[PDB]
Amino acid sequence: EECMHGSGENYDGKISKTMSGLECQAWDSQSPHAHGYIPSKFPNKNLKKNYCRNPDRDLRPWCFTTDPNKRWEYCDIPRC
Amino acid sequence: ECMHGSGENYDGKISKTMSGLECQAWDSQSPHAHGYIPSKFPNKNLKKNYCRNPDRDLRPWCFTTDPNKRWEYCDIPRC
């Protein structure tokens, strides 16, 4: 549940912060960053609250950041 | 070949930005990845690499073929 198996493709954990500490914007918000990973568009991807997810084959789970200047960033999930 | 207000209806063939950049064809993702797929908004005339205003933006636009400039506004003759 809370660690990473592989590239996070199946990670349904709770971490909400980027490798560098920034807090994730919520998947369901369009603020501060406008985007198209609408949860309802991809329900099977566990795009919840603001938890780091990897719904699209990226190296490790990431997220949209609340910092105006950083749209998104890789999170740091303990490899199981 | 000129436009109205905003160009939400332009179906002209101009394909350059207000700075001279050849536009990127809407059905390509090169040089720029984007989601203005024509199959998706079939009723918006995302025809070739013609400048268009599909999003109630301020005036026609397009994606640039210049890798560093994602997109620019076009200069359409007001009628």
Binding site: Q30, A34, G36, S40 | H34, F41, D55, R56, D57
Partner: peptide
Amino acid sequence: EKLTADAELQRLKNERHEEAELERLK
């Protein structure tokens, strides 16, 4: 209205608009 061509058309636009402002302030 979240899953409608228009809803999406507006997001896709905000994003272009956001990406270009940021590049401005670089």
